[PDB]
Each structure stands twice: as C-alpha cells, then as structure tokens.
Amino acid sequence: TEVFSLEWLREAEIKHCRVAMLAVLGVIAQEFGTFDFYNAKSKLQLSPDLHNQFVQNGALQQILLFVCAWEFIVGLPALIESVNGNREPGYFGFDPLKLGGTVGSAQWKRMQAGELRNGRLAMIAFGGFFHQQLLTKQGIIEQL
Amino acid sequence: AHTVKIYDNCIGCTQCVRACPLDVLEMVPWDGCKAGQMASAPRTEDCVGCKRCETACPTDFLSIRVYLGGETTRSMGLAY
Amino acid sequence: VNWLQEGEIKNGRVAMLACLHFFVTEFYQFPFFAGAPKLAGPAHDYFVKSGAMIQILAFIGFLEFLLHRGKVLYSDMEWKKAMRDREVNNGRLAMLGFAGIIHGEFLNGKMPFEQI
Amino acid sequence: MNLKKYLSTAPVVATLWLFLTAGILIELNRFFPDSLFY
Amino acid sequence: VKVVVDRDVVPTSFEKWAKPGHFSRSLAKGPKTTTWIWNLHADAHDFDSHTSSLEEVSRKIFSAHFGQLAIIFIWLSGMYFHGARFSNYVAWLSNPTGIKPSAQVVWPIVGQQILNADVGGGMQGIQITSGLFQLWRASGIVNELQLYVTALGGLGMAGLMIFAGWFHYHKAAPKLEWFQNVESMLNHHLAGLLGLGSLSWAGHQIHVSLPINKLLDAGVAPSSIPLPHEFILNRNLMAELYPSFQQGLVPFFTLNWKQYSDILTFKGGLSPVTGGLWLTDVAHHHLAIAVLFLVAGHMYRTNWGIGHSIKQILEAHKGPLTGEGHKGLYEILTTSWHANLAINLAMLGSLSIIVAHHMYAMPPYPYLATDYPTQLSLFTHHMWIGGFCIVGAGAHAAIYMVRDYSPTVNFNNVLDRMIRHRDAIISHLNWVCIFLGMHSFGLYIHNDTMRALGRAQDMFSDTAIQLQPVFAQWIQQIHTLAPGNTAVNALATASYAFGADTVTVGSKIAMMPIKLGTADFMVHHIHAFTIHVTTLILLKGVLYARNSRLIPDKANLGFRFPCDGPGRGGTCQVSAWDHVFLGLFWMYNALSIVIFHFSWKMQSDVWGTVTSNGAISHITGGNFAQSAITINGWLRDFLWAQASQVIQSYGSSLSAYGLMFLGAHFVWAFSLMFLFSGRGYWQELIESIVWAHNKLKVAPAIAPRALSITQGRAVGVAHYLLGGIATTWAFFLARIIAVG
Amino acid sequence: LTPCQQSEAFHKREINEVRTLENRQANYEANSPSYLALQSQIDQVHKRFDKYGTLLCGQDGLPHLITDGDWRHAREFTIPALLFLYITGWIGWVGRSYLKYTKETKNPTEQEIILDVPMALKYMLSGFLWPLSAWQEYRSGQLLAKEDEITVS
Ligand SMILES: CC1=C(C/C=C(\C)CCC[C@H](C)CCC[C@H](C)CCCC(C)C)C(=O)c2ccccc2C1=O
Ligand code: SF4
Numbered sequence A: 001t002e003v004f005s006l007e008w009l010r011e012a013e014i015k016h017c018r019v020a021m022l023a024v025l026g027v028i029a030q031e032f033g034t035f036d037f038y039n040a041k042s043k044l045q046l047s048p049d050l051h052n053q054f055v056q057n058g059a060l061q062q063i064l065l066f067v068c069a070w071e072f073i074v075g076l077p078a079l080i081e082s083v084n085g086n087r088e089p090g091y092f093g094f095d096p097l098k099l100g101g102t103v104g105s106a107q108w109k110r111m112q113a114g115e116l117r118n119g120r121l122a123m124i125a126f127g128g129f130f131h132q133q134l135l136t137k138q139g140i141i142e143q144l
Numbered sequence B: 001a002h003t004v005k006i007y008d009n010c011i012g013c014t015q016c017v018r019a020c021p022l023d024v025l026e027m028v029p030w031d032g033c034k035a036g037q038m039a040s041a042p043r044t045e046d047c048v049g050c051k052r053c054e055t056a057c058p059t060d061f062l063s064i065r066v067y068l069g070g071e072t073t074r075s076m077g078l079a080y
Numbered sequence C: 001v002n003w004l005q006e007g008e009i010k011n012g013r014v015a016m017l018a019c020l021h022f023f024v025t026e027f028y029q030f031p032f033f034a035g036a037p038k039l040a041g042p043a044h045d046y047f048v049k050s051g052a053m054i055q056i057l058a059f060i061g062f063l064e065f066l067l068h069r070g071k072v073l074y075s076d077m078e079w080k081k082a083m084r085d086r087e088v089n090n091g092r093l094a095m096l097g098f099a100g101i102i103h104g105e106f107l108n109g110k111m112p113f114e115q116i
Numbered sequence D: 001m002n003l004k005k006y007l008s009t010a011p012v013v014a015t016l017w018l019f020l021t022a023g024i025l026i027e028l029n030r031f032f033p034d035s036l037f038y
Numbered sequence E: 001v002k003v004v005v006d007r008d009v010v011p012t013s014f015e016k017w018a019k020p021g022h023f024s025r026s027l028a029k030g031p032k033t034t035t036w037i038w039n040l041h042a043d044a045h046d047f048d049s050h051t052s053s054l055e056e057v058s059r060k061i062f063s064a065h066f067g068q069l070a071i072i073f074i075w076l077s078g079m080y081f082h083g084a085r086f087s088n089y090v091a092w093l094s095n096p097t098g099i100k101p102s103a104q105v106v107w108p109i110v111g112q113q114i115l116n117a118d119v120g121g122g123m124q125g126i127q128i129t130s131g132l133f134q135l136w137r138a139s140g141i142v143n144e145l146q147l148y149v150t151a152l153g154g155l156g157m158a159g160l161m162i163f164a165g166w167f168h169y170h171k172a173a174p175k176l177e178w179f180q181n182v183e184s185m186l187n188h189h190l191a192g193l194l195g196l197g198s199l200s201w202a203g204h205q206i207h208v209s210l211p212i213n214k215l216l217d218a219g220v221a222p223s224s225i226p227l228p229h230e231f232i233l234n235r236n237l238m239a240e241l242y243p244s245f246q247q248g249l250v251p252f253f254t255l256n257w258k259q260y261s262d263i264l265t266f267k268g269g270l271s272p273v274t275g276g277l278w279l280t281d282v283a284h285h286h287l288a289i290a291v292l293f294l295v296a297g298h299m300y301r302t303n304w305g306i307g308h309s310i311k312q313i314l315e316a317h318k319g320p321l322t323g324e325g326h327k328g329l330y331e332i333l334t335t336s337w338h339a340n341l342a343i344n345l346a347m348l349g350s351l352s353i354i355v356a357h358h359m360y361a362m363p364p365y366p367y368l369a370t371d372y373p374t375q376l377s378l379f380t381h382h383m384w385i386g387g388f389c390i391v392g393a394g395a396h397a398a399i400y401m402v403r404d405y406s407p408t409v410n411f412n413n414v415l416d417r418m419i420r421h422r423d424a425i426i427s428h429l430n431w432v433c434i435f436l437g438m439h440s441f442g443l444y445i446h447n448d449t450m451r452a453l454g455r456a457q458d459m460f461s462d463t464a465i466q467l468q469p470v471f472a473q474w475i476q477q478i479h480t481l482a483p484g485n486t487a488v489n490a491l492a493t494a495s496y497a498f499g500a501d502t503v504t505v506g507s508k509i510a511m512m513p514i515k516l517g518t519a520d521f522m523v524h525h526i527h528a529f530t531i532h533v534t535t536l537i538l539l540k541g542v543l544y545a546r547n548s549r550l551i552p553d554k555a556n557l558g559f560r561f562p563c564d565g566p567g568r569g570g571t572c573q574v575s576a577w578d579h580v581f582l583g584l585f586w587m588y589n590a591l592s593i594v595i596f597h598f599s600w601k602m603q604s605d606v607w608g609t610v611t612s613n614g615a616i617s618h619i620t621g622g623n624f625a626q627s628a629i630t631i632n633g634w635l636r637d638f639l640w641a642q643a644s645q646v647i648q649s650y651g652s653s654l655s656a657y658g659l660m661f662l663g664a665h666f667v668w669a670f671s672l673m674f675l676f677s678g679r680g681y682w683q684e685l686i687e688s689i690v691w692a693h694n695k696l697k698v699a700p701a702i703a704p705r706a707l708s709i710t711q712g713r714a715v716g717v718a719h720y721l722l723g724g725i726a727t728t729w730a731f732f733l734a735r736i737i738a739v740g
Numbered sequence F: 001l002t003p004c005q006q007s008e009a010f011h012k013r014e015i016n017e018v019r020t021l022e023n024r025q026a027n028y029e030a031n032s033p034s035y036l037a038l039q040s041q042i043d044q045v046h047k048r049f050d051k052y053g054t055l056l057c058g059q060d061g062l063p064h065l066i067t068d069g070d071w072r073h074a075r076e077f078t079i080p081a082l083l084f085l086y087i088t089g090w091i092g093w094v095g096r097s098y099l100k101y102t103k104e105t106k107n108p109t110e111q112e113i114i115l116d117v118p119m120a121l122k123y124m125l126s127g128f129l130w131p132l133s134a135w136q137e138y139r140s141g142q143l144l145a146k147e148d149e150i151t152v153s
C-alpha cells in the first residue's frame, strides 16, 4: 500500500520475470535436444544428485555471482531518479510508447498492456517448472 | 537545623520555590538583578535540605546554597 | 572526494610506470639471449649470496626519494582543468587494468576460466 | 542515500572495522607461523 | 468487532535511521554528552516515554512483538540445522546410550580443538544439554533430510513474520478500535492458539508415535524404519501396529469411544522402555487439553451478542472486605498495554518454574531422565527464566501506579484498598519474612553451632527425626494409594517420585521415590524465606509506587530515578525500579538456593547406579543425610567436592567450563565496582582525564561524563546476575558431565 | 637454566603431552575421515615445539625468556612483538588525533564525532610516517591550547 515498499515489490517482480524467462529459455534451450528420447534416461547426467558437487562449475559460479552483483549494483541506482541510466531507455521506449499510445487513444497504460501479467506468469510458471522436474523422485500417485 | 545561604549569582527566575517542596525560600524585590527577584529563606527552621533547588539553579556555580547542619524533627521529614 | 582524487591519480601514474617497467624487461626476457626464458623457469632463482642486502638498500633509497618528494610537496605553498578532467578518468582506467594484467599470469596458464 | 548515513553510524563502523581486525588475526594463526629471524 | 484499518500511517524510508535518536526529539538535538549515548539505549524500549497516542503505542509494541517473534524463529530454524550438518543425532538414533549428545564443533585456529568432546558416533564436538535430541526423537525425526526440510520451512515462516511486522505498519495499520476487542482476543488465544495448538500437535503424535513407539522401542535399525507417509498412504499398516485404526473415524461418530483405546490411554507413571512418560498418554493428554480449550475459548462477547465479557464479569464480583470490588479492572487491563504485561509476566514466570518442576518430576521426553546433564540444565533454565519474568511482573506492576493510574478514570476499590491499607500488607509480609528468617536460617546457625560445639549435634538427632518425615509424608502415601482407589483408570502414580519402593531403571536410575528427610524442611523454608522477601520487596514497589509517606509528591519524579537528596536524614534509592533492582537480587538468592537444592539433592538420594549383587548406589551416596543440616556441609561436601570436576578437566574436553567458571567471578566482582561507589567521585575522575584530553585537545566533542546514577545500578545488577549465573552455569555443567 | 634442546626435562613434557593425547587418539578409528584431522593437529603440536627450543627455556619445561634487552633475545621483547604494538597502536592513535584536529568546523561537532563521512575513515591510511610529524603537531596542540584547562577549584 505504501510507496517505497511496493516499489521494491514491483521491481523484484520485473527483476526476476526476465530472469525467470531467460532461464526457462535457457533450461529448455539446453535440453531442447534431449527433452524426450527415452526421457533422457531420467534427465541423464543433468540430474543434480549425479553432479560431483560442481567441482569445475563452482569456481565459475563464483565469477558469475561476482559480475552479477555489480550488474544489480547498477540496477539499484539506475532505478533511482529518471536521468542518465533510465532516461536514455526512457525516450527510446517513448518512441515505441508514442506509437503504442497512438494505437491506444489517450495513453493506453503499458503496465496494463503487459507488465504485471508477464511478471507474474513467469514467476508462477517457473515455480511450478522447478517442482515438477526437480522436487519429486517417487510419484506414488500419477501426476496429471 | 540546616543553614541556607544565598549566593550573589541570583537571576531571580524563581526556580527555588518552584522546585522546593515545603517552601523554604521566598522571592523578595531586589535592586541588583536583571529580573529583579532575590531568593530568601526565612523559614529555615522548617528546612529539610533535600537539595532540589541546586538542580533547578541555573548559574554555573549554583546561587542557592544550603549547608548541612543539625537535624531536628522539622528537618527529618518524619510523621512520627 | 578530494582525498580519493589525489590517491586515485598518484596510483594511476604508478600504473603507467608499471606497464613500461615490465615492457622493457619482458621484451628482454623473451627473445635473443634472455637472462630469463619461460615465465615458469626462473620464478625464484637466487643470485650470489647477499641478495637481500641490495634489495633492502634499493628499498631504503627509494624510500628516501619519496620522503623528499613528499616533504617538498608540503612546502612551496602550492595553489592555496579539462586535461585534469580527462586524467581523473584515465587514472581509474589504469588501476583496474594493471591488476588484471597480473591476474593473467596468476591463472597459471591463462586458460582455467574457459572450463578446460 | 540515507542507508549510507546509517552505514556511517558509530556502531556499524565499529563492528565493520572490528570484523576486519578479528578476521585478519583468525587467518594469521591459521596460515604461516611467525618466522622471527635474529 | 469491526475491520477498522488505518492503511499507511508511517512511510518506509531510511530517513529515521540516518538520525540517531529519531524516536525522541529530546534525544536528537543535543547529543553533546556521553550520558546521551546511554540514554539513547535506556529509553529505546520505554515506548510510553515518547508519544502518548495509544493508537501509535499499540502500533509500536505489536511491531516489537513480530520483531522479537522473528528473532525467535531465526533462533529455532538454526537448531534443526546444527543437528544435521555437524552433529551425531543419527548415530545417536541408532545407539542412544554410548553416544553422548553433541551438536557444536570447533575449528583448528589457536589450539581450541581440545573442546571437541569424544561423544561417539563418528563425530566429535561439544556436548549439548538443550534437550534437542530428546525432542527430535519424540517427534519421529530420524533422517538428516527431515532436519533440513524443517529448517528450510522455518526460513519461510521467519521471513513472513518480518514482512508482517513491516506490513501492519509501514504498509497497513489497524485502528485503535482493534485493540479494545479483548473479548474477541481471548476467544482467539484460548481457542485459535491454545485450542488449535493443543489439537494440531495432538493429531501429530497419533500418527508419528509408531515410528518411535512401535518401532524404535522394538529394536529395528534406523534404515529399516519405514516412512511416515507410508503409514498414512496405507491405513492397514497403522491398523497392524494399532488394531484400532481399521475403523477409521467410524465409532468416533457412534460414540463407541472405547474402540480407540490403542493410542488413547491414561496409564500414568513412566514407560520401562523409553525412559520417560508414555508416548500414548501424551497424545490423549493433548486431545483432552484441546477439547477443553475449544470449550474455554468461547467465553466473551464477539459480534453475535452471546457470552460473558471481561466488563460485566468484573463488574459483578463484589465481596465484603473488597467494597466496590473487581469493578474497573476491565478498564485497568484494556487501557494500559503495561497493565497486561505484569499479570502476564507473573503468571508466565511462575509457569516456567512450575513446568520446570514438572520436567524432572515426570520426564515427558524419551531418554530424558537418564540424560542427567540435559535434565539438570533444563529445570534451572526455566527456573531462572521465570525468576526474571516474575521480577518483571513486579517491575511493571510498579509502573502502573506511576504511569497509568488515576483518581477519576480507572477504579477498583480492591486496588484502592491495596493502596489505602497499603502499610498493612507489607507489615504482614515483613513479620512473616522475619519469622521465616530468624528460624530457617537461624536453625542453620543453630546446627552449625551444635557441631563445632560438640555433643549438641548428637542430641539433635531426635529433632532431625522431627519436621522431616512428619509433614508431606502422608501426601506421598496418598499418591501411592491414589491409583486403583481414587484413580481406578490409572495403573501407575503421577510419577515414580510418589510410588514408594517402586524403582524403574534402564541401566541408569530414571526416577526415585524421593524420601524426604534430614534437611528438606530446612531448604524448603530457606526457599519460602527468599520467596516472601522477594514478594515483599516487589509488592512494596508495586503499591508504594503511587502514595509514599516520606515524599508525598512521588508521581512527579518518575520510575527510574536516583533519589531526592540528603534531606530528611537521607532520601536514597526510593524508586520502585530500585525495589525491582533489589527485587532482582532476592529473586536471585531465591532461585540460587532452589537450583542448589534441586541439583545436589538429586544425586544425593535420587540419581545413581544399579547392580545385581546389590540394589542402588548413588553417584554421591546419600550424603545430605547430615551434610545439609549445617552451612558447613554446603561448602564442605557441596561447594568443595565440585572443584574435582570443573578444574580437573583441562586434560580433557571440559576445559571451557573451568575458564567460564573462573571468569564469571571476574564479571561478578566487576559488578562490585558499580554497586559500591558513587558517580560523584567518578565524575571527579573524568575531569582529570579530560584535563589530559584538553592538554592535547584530544578531548572529544561529546563531553566525557560518568554513567547515570540509575544506569550504573542497572549495569551493576546486569553483572551481578551475569557473573552470578555463569558460575553455576559452569558448575551445573561441570560435575554432571564428569559424573554422567 | 639450560636450553630445551639440551634440557632433558623439557622433551619429557613433549612425550608426556603426546602420551595424554594418545589415549584420546587411539579410542577412535584412524581410518575415519572425521578423525583423520587429529594427525594434522598433532602435526601442528610437533611443529610448535621445535621453534621454542631455540629460545632459552626453563629447565622445568616451562619456557622462560628475556626482556632486559639482551640482543640474543630481542625477538621476545624489544624488536618484533613490542615495537609493532607501539607503531600499530599509535598509527591508530595519531590517525584518531588527526581526525580530532578535523573535528571542529561548521558541521556540528557531535555529527563529526559520530556520523562522520566515510571519507575521513578512508583517509586514515595517511599516517605512514607518524613519528616526528606527529611530534610537530602535538607541539602545536600544546601550543595553541595556551594552558586553557578546567578550574579545579
Ligand atoms: C567506572 C564507573 C563509572 C564510569 C563508567 C564508564 C566510563 C563506562 C565506560 C564504558 C565504555 C563502553 C568504555 C569506553 C569504550 C568506548 C565506547 C570506545 C569503544 C570503541 C570500540 C572499542 C568499539 C561510573 O560512571 C560510575 C557511576 C556510579 C558508580 C560507579 C561508577 C563506576 O565505577
Ligand atoms: S535558584 Fe538562584 S538564580 Fe534561580 S531563581 Fe533562585 S536565587 Fe535566582
């Protein structure tokens, strides 16, 4: 209900909806050639328990977690104020935003066009996409 | 009982009788201050010496001194 | 603020000196009768017996040099712009480049990042 | 903005610096022993 | 009863965190003094010393409730983690006896790895006495995976409460009207919390008992233990382990309740397999408590018109000696957030003590009675918790007459009389304290005299037969004959401390018919002495907090004030908070003597070993049959023989309990710096150091000043308690590990 | 008092300490990984005794040392463990003193003691060569003070 709290809430939704989509378009992309084909022998070597505790990938994930830090340390102040960081994509978007508003009469609020639906669809779908494939060994009951 | 002695640092802001419990001090017209008041303690026989005027006393070194003297029924604050 | 500016600039000059300090040596220890062949060979080969004495003497002499360079900066009563504005930028560009150049050799073979 | 002012408080700065001083000493007694040369 | 919400009242901004002392304008504009640094934290929790708008005070304390609640959840979520990453709970699940408890490891940095106690189970570390392993075994937890899932599930609940205490405030906010619904509050605390809580855990230990009862008590390996869902997915498995589950909620509606007798029983006593109470009696117990709370949770006016209310209930109770009795107590508790806290701290404080007694008397957890370190630690733990809580009850029952009591608004002639004949209450308690002191401790002086004098202690033997086995002996005999006679449906006593000559042993003695004698009448009256003195000084601080004979204008000064001055012969330490400061000390003496009594008397006559060639041989075999009557035996055979288990441990892994033992006397005697000296001399001591600070200008802008007169005593009692608990904390954790 | 490499009453303590540790060492299986670290711990124990033997140490096995200034034992007092304390402590102290010099000015004195801009804390590194410069500035402190102290009356 308050300003500064819902700010981080809607931001975190946007800051992860793209992450919850490039990962889906990344996990599907890496397994597009091994989705079926005898169910990839129950995910084959892609099973996390089969991995050797990420021996070779741990030192790589540390580098990724480092660069991703400053990436979000650019996202934290670029959101602050309009100028510089957000202002240049500001008038860029305003170029399609003007045409989209012309198609949508007075203004056609883009956040109602698809800022919340995409943001929540990615989160909910990725939450269910991580449980059906990574959080169930014995099914017991058939899953449909 | 207790011996009340008033310094020459008085400003006359009446802090004594405001703080003071049983009204030992008293404001008197005086010709050598800014506000024109001076604290004076006639009823020193009834003084208890609780030393709550030195708290409200403004001056760098307090203006109302009460040196500890003898103790009687009037200065012990007892009801028996 | 101002304190970072002064440091951030002095270290930028130290950087610009460090690359040229290694450019003459590396180009001397790679081709033509080099006193140091591969980067893995002469990593810590001792020389003569004193060794540490000439090192500590070089340390003391360089320390006295910076001692005078600082004490002179105190005196003189110096002072109490676009070139300075470009220099404030390339100083930051220097400090972050000279850590990475050595980070290269710290990879043993400069290949562990890309998996194999 | 104001988060840096809260980061600049006496207790936060004190705990941060004391964490640095304590961790350096934990790593010192874990790594090389004092060589000490006469 | 109405949804009245004031959405958005305080914004979410770091602006207040930038200002040190935003909660008070007096603690913001003038931080020029060292005393301000301590005042910022002393008044940080005195929420009634900021704003008077109750709609905001209620919206600053329920926030602190959720904050403290989040701290507790962060605390509990780690306990399940420590018993999985580095511990021995699974190995202890297979072998419970030889493997000592442990759930804390040290690192090789400065040779501290000596603290790694060899407990067994392929894992070394520090022994634990928190009862975690007993609780986890009583919860059916076997695999390490069940620890991590509970911990990760605790992180979610811990985060939701932070986003709740930050919700009803910076985001939402109920009105003031939502808090006078005390009628609607007890209908949800006694039925939603107590009721559904006693029912939810009841429904758990009915389907999770057999992984502990009809499995781990038979002799199956932890790997052969089936899964908890395999018993629910197949009702016939529960049906075979209990031939009552075949029905499946069919005689529950037919009122054929006797067909549920395989899990729901009233046996009594302990089980001769686990080591504690029956796993089937507690399930029926919580079911019985749940239904009682589902009934007791419907007693006050909601928004349908039926039921009583705290209003007219108290508006109806009268009484001859009370006059206008009980009336206005509704306005007492529904207006002062403080007012609820003393009755809460009082009841809950005595509750922690009473539940501590119920711990050792009837051990409710399996493998808890034999675990002597855990049992000894838990009793005294809740013992001291309730000591602090009851003194806090006095601390705030003193707050009420000063901060929220008026001679026009809230009125009970009962509380009026407690303040009208106030000089009579304490006079009675005073004479009671003196009679219980000049005798209970007088007899200690008497007996200690009789021994050093000669043949007087010899002729005291007949009096040693008196008092002891004279009273309370018939009470135990009532409980011996209570089953069968006055308890036809009970085949055992309330606890084996009642059943005479009935001893239950599982390679180590669990409980014993505590045969009173020699000096239990002595220590129980030392207790009653230290109890009446504690109640006296705290109740004195309660009812003398408003009207005092010496100084009539008492309400003007406050609660945490030094004094008035050298007048009237000397007005010094007259605040009710000082009656709590010293009330903490007599509570300290009370709880100290009680923990001494409990701890030592246990191994004296209760705790021991068993052999077939004989019968019972205690750790310390029946010593306080004589060494308790005199003061000397309390430091000749008690405080002296304990150094052989706290100091003779540097060669082993119990060296830390000796360092903390000798170091707790340091901070305790460090309290002797503040409790004896005065601010005047120390303030003359700074200005010399400030002179040295003015010599080099190294004087801080914050002018160096001494501690406050009240803050010095608050720190003094803090050290007198911390240094006065960590010694016995190191002592209770010293012998019990060596003689375990 | 003889050195411990020749003091036969010191090596016996090493043997006795390892003997007391060995009973705790042998009760558990050495092949277990959670107790394979005990051999590394006793390696630390062994690697600790050899350095102290060089220092003169008590015949009793309680290893004593020297603070008179003897150049053979300057390592236990004078040079290392002592002078660094003085420098490191005073590198903090004179840095604090420089911060005390910049504690006045217009912005409130209380704000410049507590809520300081982090930049002053980052400048702390200035004091590489305190000694005589600090002596000058401390002279100036006593000087500009001009004997302005408390009354004490
Ligand atoms: C010592 C003492 C004081 C003075 C108490 C003081 C000065 C408390 C000192 C405590 C602080 C915390 C120590 C100073 C440490 C600074 C906060 C610096 C810390 C910086 C880093 C280490 C974090 C009294 O005011 C007093 C009053 C009445 C009776 C007895 C006494 C008494 O004995
Ligand atoms: S306290 Fe002193 S200055 Fe104040 S009114 Fe009284 S005499 Fe005047």
Ligand code: SF4
Binding pocket: B016, B019, B020, B021, B022, B023, B024, B025, B047, B048, B049, B050, B051, B052, B053, B054, B066, E567
């Ligand atoms: S001595 Fe005490 S009673 Fe008399 S005026 Fe001063 S404060 Fe009041």
